[PDB]
């Protein structure tokens, strides 16, 4: 335990992590229940949500969203480039997951989920007693020290990811949608997947929430010759509004996780 320890300590912060073997069921634990803020982490259990109402609605995916008046948010580089002719719903979960895209994370929770209570459901939906997500974007990134607003663990993280992919609410059609987008993923290259041998496919999704040094990242890690995933979940905050996160923190974190669970 070391190891995790001192980095945690030079950090000057709180690192979480979560992570098992889906074969084995070797699991590791460094603060796995503790709570920290979801940031965009969110996004990839909202997208799993829109294909469910895919699959209990065949042709949601494939549904236009009109948006052409909407004021954008910040950092909704997908949903600005296509605000005139507008984007398919499919379209909308691929961005906000792959991007981190938030006009289309608010625009799948106004038409479709139901804000974000309706993410809540959802994720209780899959037995996920740990995450709540309370505010829209952008006010849900504030991180504020011991506000369990918009939070979950990175076990529950881990356990809600594991769920989407082993055959419990989407079904072989949309977990293979589903984890292509994770595959897919662009703003992952310097967490968990710095920390993931070449070869290893990796989906993952990050959040940064741009104050009190928090970011996030999870993910599933198929070591190959359909081996049960890897599961990584891994979460970090800071006291200080002003502290910057560490990307290399949650890659030395994720090499630590998969060295005692693979």
Known sequence: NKNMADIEAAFEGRVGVYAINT???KAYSYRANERFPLCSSFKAF???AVLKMDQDS?????????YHNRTMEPHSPITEKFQSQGMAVGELAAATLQYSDNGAANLLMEKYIKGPEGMTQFMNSIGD???????????????IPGDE????TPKAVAESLNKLISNTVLDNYHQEIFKKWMIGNTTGDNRIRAAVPDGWVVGDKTGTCGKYG???????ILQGNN??????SIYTTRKGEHMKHDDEVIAKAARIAIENVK
Do not use: M, Q, Y
């Open 214 to 220: 928090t970011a996030n990242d999870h993910a599933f």
């Open 58 to 66: 065949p042709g949601v995916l494939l549904e236009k969203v009109n």
């Open 227 to 232: 081996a049960a995933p890897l599961i990584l």
């Open 46 to 48: 909202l997208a799993a």
């Open 149 to 152: 607003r918009d939070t979950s």
């Open 23 to 25: 074969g084995s069921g």
């Open 129 to 143: 007693t740990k995450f709540r997500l309370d505010r829209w974007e952008l006010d849900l990134n504030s991180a």
